[PDB]
Design a protein around this ligand. Sequence first.
Ligand SMILES: Nc1cncn1[C@@H]1O[C@H](COP(=O)(O)O)[C@@H](O)[C@H]1O
Ligand SMILES: Nc1cncn1[C@@H]1O[C@H](COP(=O)(O)O)[C@@H](O)[C@H]1O
Ligand SMILES: Nc1cncn1[C@@H]1O[C@H](COP(=O)(O)O)[C@@H](O)[C@H]1O
Ligand SMILES: Nc1cncn1[C@@H]1O[C@H](COP(=O)(O)O)[C@@H](O)[C@H]1O
Lengths: 159, 160, 159, 160, 159, 160, 159, 160
Amino acid sequence: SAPVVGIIMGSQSDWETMRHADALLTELEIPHETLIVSAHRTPDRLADYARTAAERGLNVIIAGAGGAAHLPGMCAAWTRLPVLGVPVESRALKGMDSLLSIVQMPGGVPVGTLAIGASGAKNAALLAASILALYNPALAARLETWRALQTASVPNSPI
Amino acid sequence: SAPVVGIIMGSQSDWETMRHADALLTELEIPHETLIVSAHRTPDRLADYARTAAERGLNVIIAGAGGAAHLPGMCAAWTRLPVLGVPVESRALKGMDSLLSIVQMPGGVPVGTLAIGASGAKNAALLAASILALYNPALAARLETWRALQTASVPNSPIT
Amino acid sequence: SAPVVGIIMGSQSDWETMRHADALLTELEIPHETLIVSAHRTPDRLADYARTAAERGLNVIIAGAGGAAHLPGMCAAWTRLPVLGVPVESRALKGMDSLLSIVQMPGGVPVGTLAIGASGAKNAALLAASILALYNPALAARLETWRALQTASVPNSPI
Amino acid sequence: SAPVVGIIMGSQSDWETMRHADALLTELEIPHETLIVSAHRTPDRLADYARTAAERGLNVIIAGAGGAAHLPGMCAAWTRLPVLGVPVESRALKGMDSLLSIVQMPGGVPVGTLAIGASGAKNAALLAASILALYNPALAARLETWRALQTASVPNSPIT
Amino acid sequence: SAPVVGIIMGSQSDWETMRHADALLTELEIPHETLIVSAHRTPDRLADYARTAAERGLNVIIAGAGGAAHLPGMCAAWTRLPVLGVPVESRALKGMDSLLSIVQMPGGVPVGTLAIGASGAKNAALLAASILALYNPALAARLETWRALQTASVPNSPI
Amino acid sequence: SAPVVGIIMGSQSDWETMRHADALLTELEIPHETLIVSAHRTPDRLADYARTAAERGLNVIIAGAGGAAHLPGMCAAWTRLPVLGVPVESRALKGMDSLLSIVQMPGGVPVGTLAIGASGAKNAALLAASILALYNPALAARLETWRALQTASVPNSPIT
Amino acid sequence: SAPVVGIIMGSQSDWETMRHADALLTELEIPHETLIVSAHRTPDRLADYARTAAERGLNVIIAGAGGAAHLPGMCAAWTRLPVLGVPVESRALKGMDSLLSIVQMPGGVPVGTLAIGASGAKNAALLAASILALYNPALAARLETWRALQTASVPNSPI
Amino acid sequence: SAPVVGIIMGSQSDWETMRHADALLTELEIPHETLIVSAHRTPDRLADYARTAAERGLNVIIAGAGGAAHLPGMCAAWTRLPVLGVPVESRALKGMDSLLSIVQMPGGVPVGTLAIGASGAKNAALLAASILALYNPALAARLETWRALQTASVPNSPIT
Ligand SMILES: Nc1cncn1[C@@H]1O[C@H](COP(=O)(O)O)[C@@H](O)[C@H]1O
Ligand SMILES: Nc1cncn1[C@@H]1O[C@H](COP(=O)(O)O)[C@@H](O)[C@H]1O
Ligand SMILES: Nc1cncn1[C@@H]1O[C@H](COP(=O)(O)O)[C@@H](O)[C@H]1O
Ligand SMILES: Nc1cncn1[C@@H]1O[C@H](COP(=O)(O)O)[C@@H](O)[C@H]1O
């Protein structure tokens, strides 16, 4: 019941994208929390969230932001937990700024980065699941079923 | 000493970059294997490697490649384990082709991507360590110690 | 009657683009098959398709995918047949990711890459035709007519 | 020994890259010619070359150029044969201008484009070989042998 | 009455852009012709057009094309006349491919390149005018008036 | 001699670039401090530095970093003072990652960004000087003199 | 009452973007002027504006332009005052041309550059405010309140 | 020998590139002047130069600069003469910033832009020559001869 994954996003505007991570976790029955945490507008809220994440029982953090997307990196700066970053597609640069701001982390503080947009949000949740599955047999089985269904469902020819 | 992390790379030329992931895993005392698997030259070798990773005891796979880097993505397609991708810097496009070829995975098959080059390889190892640390108290302490040392080792001013 | 060209695409979403390759082949009366094969979601389906392509009588394979577009490259990894890649325009990066993921193949396993989008799909079919025309006199004549009509039809001034 | 593949390049400076296509065709015993044809400096030479390629017995044309690389595209405009383009790495833009100038052909006139640089030149030759192999059993066996050797030659682990 | 400027474009689809060059020339009363000439679909039409341009009395050629935009460069390859290139905005790459295909001409055969899109088409006509004005006093005066009106008309504050 | 400008950088490797900002401030006689603060390795050090800048007497902060450059942005998040960012050139992406990571701040938290590399560091110092000059007549005269000298020092023709 | 900040933009078309800088300054009660000044269409208007800015009592200049956005740089060339540049999102290149034309100023003449688009316009006004706050206690207090409200207002979770 | 073409550049560092335009004009016997005019460091010098170009007898202006290259555009803003811009290759962005800063002129003030670097400088001179040739029969013949020689000088095959 207690969340094992924390989904944080820099703004309400990122929800359209991050909701895909939320849906996936719920689908796999992975207890999680979904919050808005701005690296620039609420820096202390972020520091506190990242510092206490482990203590609170969180295993993985999924962070999404657009533009100069510093949320994932700064969260990883304060936590030893694995942090997965989702580049939100920005208006002008289409997430290229989001992508480079997240993936190009110097050695020492990692952020496992996923694709720009909804696909990345969905994959961040799937990656968090594959991580949790390493020590949760029941979830490991549900994830196997999910992957098997994805594979089996692909049509053989276009409509 | 059975391996729990597998480091794979498209070619010997990728080793200059991937050796950083290897060194870091060893530093944190994380048993691992290091191999060369070409997605394009040895596709069946990759299929078998990725497909049997979980049963062989691996928990995380770190895959590095450059240019049209398909190794990480195709590895993830065959394993249910988390796959971390390292974009190896390419000659002409400086790893931008490597980066986009790895990170832009469509929904359903994730690849946790790290920075282009050495930093990405080192961070892939650290990311793998933070994953393993979730269920290994001894490793968790070693990683915490490693992180705390990195922080304490930063100088307060530059050598002018 | 048996297909000599195989058109494969990573998803139904690629059909809007790949249908242009299908239309062109039908126009030139080139027997072909059109399938959905995902490099990531159906990896074994792809391995089997590429391995047996030659045995089945296929001469050329046209593969289209977007984003981290690995379909063309991985298909070429398993077949000795010429593989032509069509970069599908992605939402965020407009096919730049699709393009680099396909064209930047290291030495040893080639993929003849065409333009991003519909133009590339149409040209992949025309390129496959020009290849088949080398050993099919009737098709060679139909292709010559097609090229001649394209040239002759261009207006002399804009409307 | 009549040529069945024609390798053309915009200038002597392109040879460093295109020699890889030449070497590979010779390796697979594919008769070919190698020339310099400038789309901008010798437009009529290009027109005549491309226009008469088929009647001269050529089956495939490999064209390489850098910067605003129009050689492949203009060659394709004058021949009905398949034209393969090799983006030669440029000084400032590292072949990105070469790549986009070649691959972005509008509908109606195709250019099968390969990677920027040496890899693209080698792959253009291999692509040409896979095309010729469709109607040449002897070459088909040589290519199959070449591909099988590439696969078998990949090492299982890196030299650390 | 005889055209002194030739506006050529690779396709009817480029007209939306090149019409701005046409309008500007008409505005300055510069006799010109507007044609469709495809470098790839009508290569011989282009060779002939460029070869005979000077003989026909043309002074400047404005050429527009998108994607692998080879029209300007190949036209300049056959004529000694100044050739101005207009990168047409492409669907996927927004004219970046058009721009690089035109501006990156190696030494020896120049193409004076203008901005991507309508602005470039308008400026190609203005540049052609500034060239013609060097030997046409009446046009030089009309161009001076045009520039003076542009400058004088800029509002002092936004509405 | 109390500092009114603070120059901070992510690492010693940034000094090669940031020394230009330091040199220019000293040239214009602007008291300042120069430190290394890592946004990722010493996040709490950064928080404290940025948070206390105003009370410590600083008027402007110049922050430089490369790659995923978060130092300037996070500094601005904790201080109400104007923060100027210098994109340090990165190995693979040549500072493009540095540039976009710094300049693309969302509405609400500004970072006045300068050019990639040495020019940006020098201009950050000059921008800081033009800010301080608004309420420091002596500095205003020194800056005016500096600008007038730059203008007068430009040669009329090149050495051929 | 006399303006202490000058907002200039290359065209009426930039107003949709620059109005955000205007709104912010008015919100913080910072006396300012808002004008249209084209670096290319009204070069002398710009030279005069920049030359006399300081004499007129202006403290900071916010300049916005798109495409080959030279307005900020050329304004800084004529004034000792701090000049802040706002890259306006261009149609084709989405402000990447605007951004590079503004931020890449060689050493000697700076332009503090903000993000592409509305965010940058809003931040240019906030940056100008943080500069003015250094010598205006009342404004410093209003800016502190503004920042505090921004931070306090961020929701804890998405809707 | 009165100059009919004016070559201007932002700094001495631009000369390495712009010397190619100078050499070509001299080769074609086109009287010209070569100066350094900084749009940012000597704005009034630029205004006066561009404003008086036509009355001084100039017919074409070739302007070269790198980075945020405003020299060509601002020159065009003050003269009614055709202005040709040469993007000088920049350190970090390899002339991409130079290119976009020059070519992307909005409607109303044109700058005929050439390739990044040496090729662009040479082509700017050739473009200027083709403009002057329209009303100078002697120069027209010299240019025709120059073009015909370039064509005839292209080798038929590479040195392998
Ligand atoms: N980087 C960052 C830090 N805090 C918020 N953001 C990003 O700011 C962007 C725009 O936010 P908004 O729409 O609230 O202005 C969002 O995508 C969010 O990720
Ligand atoms: N690379 C790849 C492998 N398998 C599918 N894709 C690509 O995934 C993209 C999005 O697929 P979908 O819309 O089904 O999520 C498609 O363009 C398809 O080419
Ligand atoms: N490069 C070129 C040569 N011939 C035509 N084009 C370009 O092809 C693009 C698309 O043409 P269409 O819409 O007819 O398929 C047009 O922008 C035109 O400039
Ligand atoms: N760079 C520049 C100089 N003068 C105007 N501009 C820019 O020209 C663009 C388009 O202007 P318009 O819509 O009036 O043609 C505007 O974004 C404006 O910043």
